[PDB]
Design an enzyme around this catalytic site. Structure first.
Site, mmCIF file in Angstrom:
data_model
loop_
_atom_site.group_PDB
_atom_site.id
_atom_site.type_symbol
_atom_site.label_atom_id
_atom_site.label_comp_id
_atom_site.label_asym_id
_atom_site.label_seq_id
_atom_site.Cartn_x
_atom_site.Cartn_y
_atom_site.Cartn_z
ATOM 1 N N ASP A 37 38.809 47.387 33.688
ATOM 2 C CA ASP A 37 39.029 48.527 34.564
ATOM 3 C C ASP A 37 38.814 49.792 33.778
ATOM 4 O O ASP A 37 39.754 50.256 33.022
ATOM 5 C CB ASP A 37 40.473 48.499 35.109
ATOM 6 C CG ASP A 37 40.753 49.594 36.103
ATOM 7 O OD1 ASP A 37 39.818 50.305 36.576
ATOM 8 O OD2 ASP A 37 41.947 49.741 36.469
ATOM 9 N N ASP A 221 34.032 53.938 37.305
ATOM 10 C CA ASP A 221 35.277 53.115 37.430
ATOM 11 C C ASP A 221 34.974 51.660 37.858
ATOM 12 O O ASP A 221 34.745 51.393 39.021
ATOM 13 C CB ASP A 221 36.270 53.814 38.370
ATOM 14 C CG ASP A 221 37.499 53.000 38.631
ATOM 15 O OD1 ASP A 221 37.657 51.945 37.944
ATOM 16 O OD2 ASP A 221 38.292 53.384 39.541
HETATM 17 C C1 LIG Z 1 44.814 50.446 38.230
HETATM 18 C C2 LIG Z 1 43.707 50.300 39.301
HETATM 19 C C3 LIG Z 1 43.558 48.932 39.878
HETATM 20 C C4 LIG Z 1 42.307 48.411 40.079
HETATM 21 C C5 LIG Z 1 42.222 47.140 40.646
HETATM 22 N N1 LIG Z 1 40.972 46.637 40.894
HETATM 23 C C6 LIG Z 1 40.662 45.598 41.704
HETATM 24 O O1 LIG Z 1 41.487 44.921 42.307
HETATM 25 C C7 LIG Z 1 39.216 45.381 41.889
HETATM 26 C C8 LIG Z 1 38.758 44.629 42.995
HETATM 27 C C9 LIG Z 1 37.374 44.513 43.179
HETATM 28 C C10 LIG Z 1 36.536 45.168 42.212
HETATM 29 C C11 LIG Z 1 35.117 45.074 42.290
HETATM 30 N N2 LIG Z 1 33.992 45.016 42.335
HETATM 31 C C12 LIG Z 1 37.074 45.891 41.153
HETATM 32 N N3 LIG Z 1 38.383 45.986 41.046
HETATM 33 C C13 LIG Z 1 43.341 46.424 41.115
HETATM 34 C C14 LIG Z 1 44.583 46.981 40.916
HETATM 35 C C15 LIG Z 1 44.684 48.221 40.320
HETATM 36 F F1 LIG Z 1 45.923 48.709 40.161
HETATM 37 C C16 LIG Z 1 44.075 51.185 40.525
HETATM 38 C C17 LIG Z 1 43.339 52.525 40.471
HETATM 39 C C18 LIG Z 1 43.480 53.188 41.845
HETATM 40 F F2 LIG Z 1 42.825 54.423 41.752
HETATM 41 F F3 LIG Z 1 42.971 52.353 42.910
HETATM 42 F F4 LIG Z 1 44.819 53.492 42.028
HETATM 43 O O2 LIG Z 1 41.923 52.244 40.337
HETATM 44 C C19 LIG Z 1 41.630 51.548 39.253
HETATM 45 N N4 LIG Z 1 40.418 51.802 38.659
HETATM 46 N N5 LIG Z 1 42.410 50.648 38.755
#
Ligand SMILES: C[C@@]1(c2cc(NC(=O)c3ccc(C#N)cn3)ccc2F)C[C@H](C(F)(F)F)OC(N)=N1
Ligand code: NA
Ligand code: NA
Length: 370
Positions: A37, A221
């Protein structure tokens, strides 16, 4: 340098569930799959037997675990997790041959955070201390890796849209992309924040004050799926894609990601999207071009695809939608991010994702939001 054959193909995933790498924590090593992430800065792992998890961190089994006697509570628009802060030994088996003492947040309570049916159990936040929780003194995994070893201060991501890909830690692997890398400055080390200086839908400019593209930030991201655009840019962007393809009609809910759309076993109607990014040199930009193959995401567990561009109030988010067309080099030592055409990007006979330059763009510093 240039050749990291052991690290190639070290990411796995299911469409819609992100990309994860295998990691080990504690002594003896406990193997965990961990979400990659670039939009967060905590290393946070399930540490209790939530029913959705295949495996979780059992601190009691680890002779090297040290408790920091400090809790953390992390809410998101949808989602929260709480946990206990500690440090332990961490390696990446298909990454560099090194072990580091890293902060780990052992998640003891979570809501809407873990995905039912997914194969990962924690998240590896690869961005900077500034957005670490509780505060910026909790040094992120990557900063500890660079501090404690000789691994250079950079990593690169090839996300191939069962998904797979490569996280090269400490370098770049040339087999992973074609043509040349082009670099955009990281504007501030918090998120991986960049500056978009122009947007074109099928080679027509949205013609917006460029400050609109980055209101209030644009970031790269890997932990978000969609290309997310500021409301006002999103409005202009769908209006333009509707017009480009209106040889076929879609329910309006489709464009709000509110319903899916279906054919049997139709790409040439959908236009390409060009984002121009601030270049390394004064008045110079470069551009990345994505295909409808990136913005129309197949849905299984129903040929039905979803519109994967969406509105935002947190700025532009270049998610997995964008990243899957490119090799992306997070070049932290020089505060810059590099793009090149990915060697594995989803394409066809007619057009291909592209990274082209240089372009002359004036007043690029006006495009940033303060
Ligand atoms: C910390 C956070 C996060 C990401 C994911 N990501 C996923 O579940 C996911 C699912 C599918 C794909 C793909 N392709 C990528 N990632 C799940 C939980 C979470 F807390 C939340 C944060 C937020 F801004 F959302 F708070 O955005 C980012 N960047 N990471
Ligand atoms: Na070092
Ligand atoms: Na190459």
């Amino acid at each position: 340098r240039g050749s990291f054959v052991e690290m190639v193909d070290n990411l796995r995933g299911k469409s819609g569930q992100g990309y994860y790498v295998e990691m080990t924590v504690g002594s003896p090593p406990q193997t965990l799959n961990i979400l990659v992430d670039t939009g967060s800065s905590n290393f946070a792992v399930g540490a209790a037997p939530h029913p959705f998890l295949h495996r979780y961190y059992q601190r009691q089994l680890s002779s090297t675990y040290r408790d920091l006697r400090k809790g953390v509570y992390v809410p998101y628009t949808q989602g929260k997790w709480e946990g206990e802060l500690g440090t332990d030994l961490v390696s990446i088996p298909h990454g560099p041959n090194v072990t580091v003492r890293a902060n780990i947040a052992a998640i003891t309570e979570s809501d809407k955070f873990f995905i039912n049916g997914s194969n990962w159990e924690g998240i590896l936040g690869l961005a900077y201390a500034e957005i670490a929780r509780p505060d910026d003194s909790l040094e992120p995994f990557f900063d500890s890796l660079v501090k404690q070893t000789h691994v250079p201060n950079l990593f690169s991501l090839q996300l191939c849209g069962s998904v797979g890909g490569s996280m090269i830690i400490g370098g770049i692997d040339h087999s992973l992309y074609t043509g040349s890398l082009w670099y955009t400055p990281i504007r501030r080390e918090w998120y991986y924040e960049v500056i978009i200086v122009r947007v074109e839908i099928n080679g027509q400019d949205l013609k917006m004050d460029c400050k609109e593209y980055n209101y209030d930030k644009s970031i790269v991201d890997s932990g978000t799926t969609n290309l997310r655009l500021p409301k006002k840019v999103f409005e202009a962007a769908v209006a333009s894609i509707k017009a480009a393809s209106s040889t076929e009609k879609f329910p309006d809910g489709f464009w709000l990601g509110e319903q899916l759309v279906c054919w049997q076993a139709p790409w040439n109607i959908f236009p390409v999207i060009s984002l121009y990014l601030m270049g390394e040199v004064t008045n110079q930009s470069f551009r990345i071009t994505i295909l409808p193959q990136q913005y129309l995401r197949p849905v299984e567990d129903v040929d039905c695809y979803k519109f994967a561009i969406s509105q935002s109030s947190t700025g532009t988010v270049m998610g997995a939608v964008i990243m899957e067309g490119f090799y992306v080099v997070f070049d932290r030592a020089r505060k810059r991010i590099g793009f090149a055409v990915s060697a594995c990007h989803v394409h066809d006979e007619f057009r291909t994702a592209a990274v082209e330059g240089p372009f002359v763009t004036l007043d690029m510093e006006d495009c940033g939001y303060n």
